Amino acid sequence: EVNVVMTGDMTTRLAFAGEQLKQALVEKGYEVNQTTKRSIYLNLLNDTTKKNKERFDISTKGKNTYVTGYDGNGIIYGCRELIDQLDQSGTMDFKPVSDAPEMVLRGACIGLQKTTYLPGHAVYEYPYTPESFPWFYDKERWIKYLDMMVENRMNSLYLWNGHPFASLVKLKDYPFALEVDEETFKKNEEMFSFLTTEAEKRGIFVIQMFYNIIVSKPFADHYGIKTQDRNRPITPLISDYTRKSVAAFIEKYPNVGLLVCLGEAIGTYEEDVEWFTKTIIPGIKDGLKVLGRTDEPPVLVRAHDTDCKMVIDAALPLYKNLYTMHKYNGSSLTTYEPRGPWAKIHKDLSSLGSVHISNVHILANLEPWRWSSPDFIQKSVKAMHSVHGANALHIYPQANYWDWPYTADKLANGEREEQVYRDWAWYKAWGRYAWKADRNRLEEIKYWDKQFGDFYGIPAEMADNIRIAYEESGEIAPKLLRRFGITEGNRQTLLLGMFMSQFVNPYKYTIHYGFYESCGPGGEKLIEYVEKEWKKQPHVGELPLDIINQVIEHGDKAVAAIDKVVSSAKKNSDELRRLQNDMHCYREYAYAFYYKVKAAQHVLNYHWGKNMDELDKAVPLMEESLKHYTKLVDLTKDTYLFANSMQTAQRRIPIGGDDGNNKTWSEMLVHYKAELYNFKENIEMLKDKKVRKCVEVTPLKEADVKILNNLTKVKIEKGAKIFSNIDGGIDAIAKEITGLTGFVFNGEKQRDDATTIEFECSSPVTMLVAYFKDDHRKFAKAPRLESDASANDYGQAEPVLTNALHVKGVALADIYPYKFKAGRHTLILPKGYCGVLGFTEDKIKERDVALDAPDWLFY
Ligand SMILES: O=C(O)[C@H]1O[C@@H](O)[C@H](O)[C@@H](O)[C@H]1O
Ligand code: NA
Ligand code: NA
Ligand code: NA
Ligand code: NA
Ligand code: NA
Ligand code: NA
Ligand code: NA
Ligand code: NA
């Protein structure tokens, strides 16, 4: 009934192509004969030309269909086109196709990472064990993932871990380094042997990613060092262990690629370069040299928390075959019109003429609801080509990265909804448009009508309503985040909401340059719009009141769309009901958000004109916002375990996610309610007493601290020299700080060596640390969660006293707090000029010393 002939040299990938073509033929009637009436010839060439990689031709000639694969991936993707054409038409006549993928690497990532740190381990550190990661040892579950990967014609799988080597390689010189028992090493060995075998037959490259500088805890416990400390120098020993470990990994897993992050535990770009050129690359060559390999297989290097151009500039004489990675829209998905300074980084990395991989990273602003908008994804990949000059793709899970393999969805009696079931369209869209981006958009709505229809057992025409829900709801998180968001970072969980404070005083919640300038069409923040209204300047670009208008029409339409289609389902009906609850969530969130912003404008108008009417107007709008948030909670309280999957104190917006708190809509309603109580109390006091609450400014009393590493003390007051190497003393100093006992360091010595403070305290203290506001690189940069997970370990992420210190012929400084228990402490501050102004047991009150900001009405 149907012959399937396989021609030439076997190879695992030709076999697999045949295995898959057989399955689908039988799976639809049709009897078969395999070999070397109606025939399909699978032909495979040897073709070196880097031009025809992953390419296939399909022609037909009477009763005989021919698939030419220019290489192993090519024949696989040839057989995929037959199968898809079969899946979409009745028939077994085949439309001729001559085709190759546009993007040369197309791939996705699984974090061997957890929602929370692990006792005795720092951020990103999770040994490969069945205790932490049962799912990693499940072969049934790997074949399901890999088949989804091949079906979407993705050719790369990236495993993300802080320090994977201690789980996978033994070193004679460091045999105590090992982070797993003997039985767990054997299973790691079996599971990588099986992963790479099974990925290979499917044309999938397996890529192990690691951060730096991180060592094993046993390695650390023995030598007396930490597993990781961002600002600690490179040492021969840590270097020797990392080098031998990579040499080992290469020898043992010759077909597994490496994705290097030169972060987040390396303090300067120079140390970033020393590490890659003197430790990693020498290590990769040790392995190649043992394997007797003349060639240089590609090594992948991220832009994250390094100077991408500096590091490739430095490395290419040592190793030709570098590929680069950079985030698409930072740690979120905001636009298909990215631009500005982040575009240029992409574009310089891209203008090497190698591979440059767009990382759709973390999707903080999508967590945790269903998101898979064909149109948004198509337009995005097109921007990757035209703006960013990317020619490859790496994609995170749509949501719940940190909790693989499960979505955050709450099912009856503790059943966990799985991520490969829920987010199929996500993987299928990125995969589709990575293969070919320019596809007739109307032709595309038919294909997606049938994809959503097949899955729910609905006709395509009725299923078009499912596509609208996805494309209408899909614009909401991106628009709100680029236009009102504090950060593209997972330091923010957009879909829990924002306080009025964060709408009327965004700069107080720290907004790094490059976010608003890159992750959307230009346009005004709410404070800029309102400042423009009161000063009668014209408005330029994308405006906040337009967006909230767009965003509630997105909500209304997505709801009207899914509500038509939801009871038609012959299949996955329970899932379709969770999609409908999701769209009602996005609608109530949109309306909550709309009314809140509207109220914020009204409080900003009070800021500029001091009309009381303005504040009165805000109350009804805050009530209505709260109504819609109360409606959100009913929908979420029985359908979601949480929103954010990073459930640590690295989550700062809308508030701390310390110890896993403040990770549900229910918890947030408690704080949003309090918000309005305070507001209506503050209004009432204005209307009786005509007084507001403002900071009372009192000196911080000096803690009873002893210093263990013989620092020089200085009193902090106008004139004190906190730098020994400049003649300039202090010429401005916040009243809070004067009196305190701080330290004198050599700024030159701080560039080369940093700043170790070693002290004991008999009750809890805050150390006050001055970071100078100056792009000159001689200055230590302030802590920054976006680049550095440990930047809130002492509660130092955001500053307490801004514009609080000036030294003559240096700069202005913000004061940051480093909070410590009673105990004995060592801490290395970033290389560069910086101040240490002393220690207080006292409560610290946030103040902009320059100044009364519009957001005391909420406190
Ligand atoms: O890019 C990275 O690896 C990191 O980026 C940080 O900003 C984020 O908070 C981390 O959880 C991690 O995703
Ligand atoms: Na057909
Ligand atoms: Na351990
Ligand atoms: Na990246
Ligand atoms: Na809830
Ligand atoms: Na925490
Ligand atoms: Na002392
Ligand atoms: Na000056
Ligand atoms: Na402590």
Tab-separated table of C-alpha atoms in Angstrom, residues 1-5 25 30-33 37-41 58-66 82 85-86 91-95:
chain	number	residue	atom	x	y	z
A	1	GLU	CA	0.000	0.000	0.000
A	2	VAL	CA	2.958	2.463	0.748
A	3	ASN	CA	6.720	1.567	0.298
A	4	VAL	CA	9.332	3.581	2.295
A	5	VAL	CA	12.846	3.113	0.809
A	25	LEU	CA	1.537	6.275	7.810
A	30	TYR	CA	-1.878	2.459	5.207
A	31	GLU	CA	0.324	-0.705	5.296
A	32	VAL	CA	4.160	-0.349	4.809
A	33	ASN	CA	7.429	-2.064	3.564
A	37	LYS	CA	2.743	0.993	-6.439
A	38	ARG	CA	3.152	4.116	-4.156
A	39	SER	CA	6.759	4.662	-2.875
A	40	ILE	CA	8.528	7.354	-0.737
A	41	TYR	CA	12.363	7.434	-1.247
A	58	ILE	CA	10.564	17.058	-1.841
A	59	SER	CA	9.578	16.341	-5.476
A	60	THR	CA	6.930	13.846	-6.743
A	61	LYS	CA	6.963	11.946	-10.091
A	62	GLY	CA	4.012	9.634	-10.878
A	63	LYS	CA	3.698	7.110	-7.985
A	64	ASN	CA	7.098	8.037	-6.370
A	65	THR	CA	7.791	10.798	-3.767
A	66	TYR	CA	11.514	11.683	-3.213
A	82	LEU	CA	5.392	14.843	4.672
A	85	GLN	CA	1.150	17.778	5.042
A	86	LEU	CA	-0.502	14.439	5.975
A	91	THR	CA	-4.253	13.040	1.417
A	92	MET	CA	-0.938	11.311	0.529
A	93	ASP	CA	-0.208	13.505	-2.513
A	94	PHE	CA	2.646	15.873	-1.479
A	95	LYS	CA	3.067	19.523	-2.502
